[PDB]
Amino acid sequence: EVASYCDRVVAAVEKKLMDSFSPSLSQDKMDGEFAHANIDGISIRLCLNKGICSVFYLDGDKIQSTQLSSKEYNNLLSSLPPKQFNLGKVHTITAPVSGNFKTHKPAPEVIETAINCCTSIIPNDDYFPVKDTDFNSVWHDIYRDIRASDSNSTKIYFNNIEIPLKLIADLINELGINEFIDSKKELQMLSYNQLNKIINSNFPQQDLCFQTEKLLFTSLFQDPAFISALTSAFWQSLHITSSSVEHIYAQIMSENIENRLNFMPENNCGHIIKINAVVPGRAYEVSSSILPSHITCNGVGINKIETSYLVHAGTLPSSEGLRNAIPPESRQVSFAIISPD
Protein backbone atom coordinates (compact mmCIF):
# COMPACT_ATOMS: atom_id res chain seq x y z
CA GLU A 1 0.00 0.00 0.00
CA VAL A 2 2.63 2.50 1.10
CA ALA A 3 4.71 2.39 -2.14
CA SER A 4 2.52 0.10 -4.41
CA TYR A 5 4.23 1.36 -7.57
CA CYS A 6 5.76 4.47 -5.95
CA ASP A 7 8.97 2.60 -6.94
CA ARG A 8 7.57 2.41 -10.53
CA VAL A 9 8.07 6.14 -10.10
CA VAL A 10 11.86 5.62 -9.80
CA ALA A 11 12.00 2.91 -12.55
CA ALA A 12 10.63 5.51 -15.07
CA VAL A 13 12.81 8.64 -14.49
CA GLU A 14 12.31 13.45 -3.20
CA LYS A 15 14.18 10.10 -3.43
CA LYS A 16 14.74 9.62 0.29
CA LEU A 17 13.14 6.30 -0.49
CA MET A 18 16.22 4.90 -2.25
CA ASP A 19 18.43 4.87 0.83
CA SER A 20 16.29 2.18 2.41
CA PHE A 21 17.98 0.06 -0.18
CA SER A 22 21.04 -1.69 1.13
CA PRO A 23 23.44 -4.21 -0.31
CA SER A 24 21.79 -7.53 0.40
CA LEU A 25 24.48 -9.45 2.34
CA SER A 26 23.15 -12.33 4.45
CA GLN A 27 22.50 -15.82 3.15
CA ASP A 28 18.73 -15.35 3.81
CA LYS A 29 18.93 -13.36 0.53
CA MET A 30 16.96 -14.52 -2.49
CA ASP A 31 18.77 -15.89 -5.50
CA GLY A 32 20.53 -13.13 -7.35
CA GLU A 33 19.48 -10.66 -4.69
CA PHE A 34 21.76 -7.64 -4.82
CA ALA A 35 19.73 -5.17 -2.78
CA HIS A 36 16.72 -5.04 -0.46
CA ALA A 37 14.47 -2.38 1.11
CA ASN A 38 12.43 -2.75 4.29
CA ILE A 39 9.49 -0.35 4.28
CA ASP A 40 6.10 -0.55 6.05
CA GLY A 41 5.96 -4.33 6.51
CA ILE A 42 6.79 -4.36 2.84
CA SER A 43 10.22 -5.67 1.90
CA ILE A 44 11.44 -5.10 -1.61
CA ARG A 45 14.08 -7.39 -3.12
CA LEU A 46 16.19 -6.47 -6.11
CA CYS A 47 17.46 -9.48 -8.07
CA LEU A 48 19.82 -10.16 -10.96
CA ASN A 49 19.87 -13.44 -12.87
CA LYS A 50 22.11 -13.64 -15.92
CA GLY A 51 21.86 -10.00 -16.96
CA ILE A 52 18.18 -9.66 -16.11
CA CYS A 53 16.73 -7.71 -13.22
CA SER A 54 13.65 -8.81 -11.27
CA VAL A 55 11.87 -6.85 -8.56
CA PHE A 56 9.95 -8.54 -5.78
CA TYR A 57 7.21 -6.42 -4.34
CA LEU A 58 6.30 -9.75 -2.89
CA ASP A 59 4.91 -8.13 0.28
CA GLY A 60 1.65 -6.66 1.30
CA ASP A 61 2.98 -9.49 3.43
CA LYS A 62 1.39 -12.71 2.19
CA ILE A 63 1.20 -10.94 -1.18
CA GLN A 64 3.84 -11.24 -3.97
CA SER A 65 4.42 -9.33 -7.17
CA THR A 66 7.30 -9.42 -9.65
CA GLN A 67 8.19 -7.71 -12.91
CA LEU A 68 11.13 -7.91 -15.32
CA SER A 69 12.76 -4.72 -16.63
CA SER A 70 14.68 -3.78 -19.85
CA LYS A 71 16.33 -0.35 -19.95
CA GLU A 72 14.03 0.61 -17.16
CA TYR A 73 16.79 -1.26 -15.30
CA ASN A 74 19.21 1.39 -16.40
CA ASN A 75 16.90 3.91 -14.72
CA LEU A 76 16.98 1.82 -11.59
CA LEU A 77 20.75 1.84 -11.40
CA SER A 78 20.89 5.66 -11.39
CA SER A 79 18.26 6.09 -8.68
CA LEU A 80 20.21 3.63 -6.48
CA PRO A 81 22.06 5.22 -3.48
CA PRO A 82 25.86 5.72 -3.16
CA LYS A 83 26.49 2.19 -1.96
CA GLN A 84 28.64 -0.73 -3.04
CA PHE A 85 26.34 -3.30 -4.63
CA ASN A 86 26.91 -6.66 -6.22
CA LEU A 87 25.97 -5.84 -9.77
CA GLY A 88 27.76 -7.87 -12.49
CA LYS A 89 29.87 -5.76 -14.84
CA VAL A 90 31.18 -2.31 -14.09
CA HIS A 91 28.16 -0.20 -15.05
CA THR A 92 27.92 3.14 -16.85
CA ILE A 93 25.64 5.91 -15.72
CA THR A 94 24.78 8.89 -17.92
CA ALA A 95 24.56 12.35 -16.32
CA PRO A 96 21.97 14.85 -17.61
CA VAL A 97 23.95 16.89 -20.15
CA SER A 98 25.07 16.53 -23.76
CA GLY A 99 28.76 15.84 -24.08
CA ASN A 100 31.40 18.34 -25.08
CA PHE A 101 34.80 17.57 -26.53
CA LYS A 102 35.94 21.13 -26.09
CA THR A 103 35.65 21.74 -22.35
CA HIS A 104 38.67 21.37 -20.10
CA LYS A 105 36.58 19.70 -17.36
CA PRO A 106 33.66 17.39 -16.36
CA ALA A 107 30.15 18.84 -16.51
CA PRO A 108 29.11 19.72 -12.91
CA GLU A 109 25.97 17.51 -13.29
CA VAL A 110 28.43 14.80 -14.18
CA ILE A 111 30.38 15.55 -11.00
CA GLU A 112 27.04 15.36 -9.16
CA THR A 113 25.80 12.00 -10.49
CA ALA A 114 29.27 10.68 -9.88
CA ILE A 115 29.05 11.55 -6.23
CA ASN A 116 25.55 10.22 -5.74
CA CYS A 117 25.50 7.07 -7.84
CA CYS A 118 26.22 3.49 -6.76
CA THR A 119 29.19 1.32 -7.61
CA SER A 120 29.52 -2.31 -8.46
CA ILE A 121 31.78 -4.49 -6.34
CA ILE A 122 34.77 -6.17 -7.88
CA PRO A 123 35.06 -9.58 -6.17
CA ASN A 124 38.57 -9.89 -4.87
CA ASP A 125 39.88 -13.44 -4.64
CA ASP A 126 43.59 -13.06 -5.26
CA TYR A 127 44.23 -10.69 -2.36
CA PHE A 128 47.70 -9.15 -2.34
CA PRO A 129 49.82 -9.77 0.75
CA VAL A 130 50.87 -6.62 2.57
CA LYS A 131 54.03 -4.99 1.08
CA ASP A 132 56.50 -3.15 3.42
CA THR A 133 55.81 -0.10 1.26
CA ASP A 134 52.04 0.08 1.90
CA PHE A 135 50.90 3.59 2.91
CA ASN A 136 54.37 5.14 2.84
CA SER A 137 53.12 8.01 0.72
CA VAL A 138 50.22 8.67 3.06
CA TRP A 139 51.18 11.91 4.89
CA HIS A 140 52.33 13.44 1.62
CA ASP A 141 49.14 12.21 -0.11
CA ILE A 142 46.87 14.07 2.37
CA TYR A 143 49.07 17.16 2.34
CA ARG A 144 48.83 17.42 -1.49
CA ASP A 145 45.22 16.47 -1.93
CA ILE A 146 43.88 18.87 0.73
CA ARG A 147 45.97 21.86 -0.48
CA ALA A 148 44.40 21.47 -3.93
CA SER A 149 41.00 20.55 -2.51
CA ASP A 150 37.85 21.97 -4.07
CA SER A 151 35.07 22.26 -1.49
CA ASN A 152 32.69 20.61 -3.97
CA SER A 153 35.00 18.03 -5.60
CA THR A 154 36.13 16.86 -2.14
CA LYS A 155 33.90 16.55 0.89
CA ILE A 156 34.38 14.68 4.16
CA TYR A 157 31.64 13.36 6.41
CA PHE A 158 31.41 11.81 9.84
CA ASN A 159 28.19 10.02 10.68
CA ASN A 160 26.85 12.07 7.80
CA ILE A 161 28.01 15.40 9.20
CA GLU A 162 30.07 17.47 6.75
CA ILE A 163 33.41 18.40 8.21
CA PRO A 164 34.54 21.69 6.63
CA LEU A 165 37.54 21.41 4.32
CA LYS A 166 39.32 24.38 5.76
CA LEU A 167 38.85 22.82 9.22
CA ILE A 168 40.60 19.56 8.26
CA ALA A 169 43.36 21.60 6.64
CA ASP A 170 43.86 23.32 10.02
CA LEU A 171 43.80 19.89 11.63
CA ILE A 172 46.62 18.37 9.58
CA ASN A 173 48.77 21.42 10.04
CA GLU A 174 48.53 21.26 13.84
CA LEU A 175 49.39 17.53 13.61
CA GLY A 176 52.64 18.27 11.83
CA ILE A 177 51.96 17.14 8.26
CA ASN A 178 53.94 19.74 6.17
CA GLU A 179 56.34 19.38 3.26
CA PHE A 180 59.02 19.00 5.93
CA ILE A 181 57.78 15.74 7.53
CA ASP A 182 59.13 12.17 7.64
CA SER A 183 56.98 9.61 5.80
CA LYS A 184 57.73 7.21 8.61
CA LYS A 185 56.76 9.27 11.74
CA GLU A 186 53.93 8.16 14.03
CA LEU A 187 51.80 11.16 14.95
CA GLN A 188 51.76 12.83 18.35
CA MET A 189 48.11 13.40 19.27
CA LEU A 190 46.63 16.79 20.15
CA SER A 191 45.53 18.36 23.41
CA TYR A 192 41.99 19.54 24.14
CA ASN A 193 43.50 22.98 24.16
CA GLN A 194 45.20 22.65 20.78
CA LEU A 195 42.12 21.49 18.88
CA ASN A 196 39.47 23.37 20.80
CA LYS A 197 41.16 26.39 19.30
CA ILE A 198 40.74 25.28 15.70
CA ILE A 199 37.12 24.09 15.87
CA ASN A 200 36.42 27.61 17.13
CA SER A 201 38.08 29.51 14.29
CA ASN A 202 36.27 27.38 11.72
CA PHE A 203 32.95 27.86 13.38
CA PRO A 204 33.57 31.51 14.35
CA GLN A 205 29.82 31.71 14.99
CA GLN A 206 28.25 30.57 18.25
CA ASP A 207 24.96 29.10 17.00
CA LEU A 208 23.31 26.52 19.22
CA CYS A 209 23.44 23.73 16.61
CA PHE A 210 27.18 24.10 15.94
CA GLN A 211 27.66 23.88 19.71
CA THR A 212 26.91 20.16 19.65
CA GLU A 213 28.81 19.41 16.42
CA LYS A 214 31.75 21.02 18.10
CA LEU A 215 31.53 18.64 21.06
CA LEU A 216 31.91 15.61 18.71
CA PHE A 217 34.67 17.09 16.61
CA THR A 218 36.47 18.30 19.70
CA SER A 219 36.55 14.72 20.93
CA LEU A 220 36.82 12.87 17.58
CA PHE A 221 40.01 14.71 16.58
CA GLN A 222 41.68 13.29 19.68
CA ASP A 223 40.99 9.68 18.74
CA PRO A 224 44.01 8.06 17.03
CA ALA A 225 41.78 5.51 15.35
CA PHE A 226 40.00 8.46 13.83
CA ILE A 227 42.83 10.44 12.37
CA SER A 228 44.04 7.02 11.14
CA ALA A 229 40.76 6.40 9.37
CA LEU A 230 40.76 9.99 8.07
CA THR A 231 44.36 10.04 6.70
CA SER A 232 44.27 6.52 5.22
CA ALA A 233 41.36 7.37 2.88
CA PHE A 234 43.99 9.43 1.05
CA TRP A 235 46.70 6.89 0.41
CA GLN A 236 47.16 6.93 -3.36
CA SER A 237 47.04 3.18 -3.99
CA LEU A 238 44.34 2.45 -1.42
CA HIS A 239 42.20 0.75 -4.05
CA ILE A 240 44.82 -1.51 -5.72
CA THR A 241 44.11 -4.67 -3.75
CA SER A 242 43.98 -7.67 -6.10
CA SER A 243 44.68 -8.92 -9.59
CA SER A 244 40.94 -8.97 -10.17
CA VAL A 245 40.77 -5.32 -9.37
CA GLU A 246 44.03 -4.52 -11.12
CA HIS A 247 42.47 -6.07 -14.21
CA ILE A 248 39.41 -3.83 -14.15
CA TYR A 249 41.44 -0.75 -13.34
CA ALA A 250 43.85 -1.35 -16.18
CA GLN A 251 40.99 -2.11 -18.55
CA ILE A 252 39.59 1.29 -17.61
CA MET A 253 42.77 3.32 -17.69
CA SER A 254 43.41 2.01 -21.16
CA GLU A 255 39.86 2.68 -22.38
CA ASN A 256 40.51 6.17 -21.08
CA ILE A 257 43.71 6.64 -23.12
CA GLU A 258 42.19 5.14 -26.30
CA ASN A 259 39.25 7.56 -25.92
CA ARG A 260 41.21 10.70 -25.15
CA LEU A 261 43.06 9.77 -28.34
CA ASN A 262 40.10 9.13 -30.65
CA PHE A 263 38.11 12.11 -29.44
CA MET A 264 40.06 14.86 -27.70
CA PRO A 265 43.77 14.80 -28.45
CA GLU A 266 45.52 17.84 -26.94
CA ASN A 267 42.60 15.61 -13.94
CA ASN A 268 43.03 16.07 -10.14
CA CYS A 269 39.37 15.31 -9.32
CA GLY A 270 39.07 14.54 -5.67
CA HIS A 271 37.78 12.51 -2.80
CA ILE A 272 34.47 11.77 -1.20
CA ILE A 273 35.26 10.29 2.18
CA LYS A 274 32.50 9.08 4.48
CA ILE A 275 33.47 7.94 7.98
CA ASN A 276 31.06 6.33 10.45
CA ALA A 277 31.79 5.15 13.96
CA VAL A 278 30.58 1.69 14.89
CA VAL A 279 30.57 -1.10 17.50
CA PRO A 280 33.95 -2.90 18.06
CA GLY A 281 38.09 3.30 22.43
CA ARG A 282 35.81 2.95 19.39
CA ALA A 283 36.16 1.63 15.79
CA TYR A 284 35.43 3.38 12.44
CA GLU A 285 33.99 2.24 9.13
CA VAL A 286 35.40 4.32 6.34
CA SER A 287 34.63 4.86 2.69
CA SER A 288 36.84 6.68 0.23
CA SER A 289 35.48 7.17 -3.27
CA ILE A 290 37.90 8.89 -5.59
CA LEU A 291 36.80 10.59 -8.81
CA PRO A 292 39.44 10.34 -11.53
CA SER A 293 38.55 12.03 -14.86
CA HIS A 294 37.66 9.45 -17.55
CA ILE A 295 36.85 10.17 -21.17
CA THR A 296 33.69 8.49 -22.29
CA CYS A 297 32.67 8.64 -25.97
CA ASN A 298 29.87 11.19 -25.47
CA GLY A 299 32.49 13.46 -23.95
CA VAL A 300 34.35 13.90 -20.67
CA GLY A 301 33.04 11.83 -17.79
CA ILE A 302 34.43 10.27 -14.67
CA ASN A 303 35.47 6.93 -13.23
CA LYS A 304 34.27 6.51 -9.63
CA ILE A 305 36.37 4.10 -7.61
CA GLU A 306 35.10 3.52 -4.09
CA THR A 307 37.08 1.53 -1.56
CA SER A 308 35.93 0.88 1.97
CA TYR A 309 37.34 -0.76 5.05
CA LEU A 310 37.38 -0.97 8.83
CA VAL A 311 39.87 0.97 10.91
CA HIS A 312 39.78 -0.95 14.17
CA ALA A 313 39.78 0.66 17.62
CA GLY A 314 43.47 0.61 18.53
CA THR A 315 45.13 1.70 15.25
CA LEU A 316 47.75 4.44 15.44
CA PRO A 317 48.52 6.99 12.65
CA SER A 318 51.72 5.79 10.98
CA SER A 319 52.46 4.27 7.65
CA GLU A 320 53.15 1.22 9.77
CA GLY A 321 50.07 0.96 11.93
CA LEU A 322 47.95 1.72 8.89
CA ARG A 323 49.26 -0.96 6.55
CA ASN A 324 48.72 -3.61 9.19
CA ALA A 325 45.32 -2.41 10.35
CA ILE A 326 44.06 -2.05 6.79
CA PRO A 327 45.75 -4.94 4.90
CA PRO A 328 44.83 -5.27 1.23
CA GLU A 329 42.88 -8.39 2.26
CA SER A 330 40.30 -6.17 4.09
CA ARG A 331 39.54 -3.31 1.68
CA GLN A 332 36.50 -3.61 -0.65
CA VAL A 333 36.58 -1.96 -4.08
CA SER A 334 33.90 -1.06 -6.63
CA PHE A 335 33.73 0.91 -9.87
CA ALA A 336 31.30 3.06 -11.81
CA ILE A 337 31.57 5.02 -14.96
CA ILE A 338 29.81 8.34 -15.24
CA SER A 339 29.43 9.63 -18.80
CA PRO A 340 27.76 12.78 -20.21
CA ASP A 341 25.44 12.60 -23.20
CATH 3.10.450.460 in the chain, residues?
1-69
Three-class secondary structure of residue 147 per DSSP: helix
What does the radius of gyration of the chain's CA atoms come to, in whole angstroms? Answer: 21
Tell me whether strands 66-69 and 161-163 are parallel, antiparallel or unpaired.
unpaired
**Residue 150 CB contacts under 8 Å (≥ 6 apart), including other chains:** 270
The technique is X-ray
Q: What's the CA gap between 111 and 106, in Å, rounded? A: 7
The backbone torsions φ and ψ at residue 201, rounded to the nearest 5 degrees and listed phi first, read -85, -5
Written in H, E and C, the secondary structure of 274-306 is EEEEECCCCEEEEEEEECCEEECCCCEEEEEEE
Tell me whether strands 84-85 and 119-121 are parallel, antiparallel or unpaired.
parallel
Identify the architecture of domain 1-69 in CATH: Roll (3.10)
For 61-169, list the strands marked E by DSSP.
66-69, 84-85, 92-94, 119-121, 155-158, 161-163
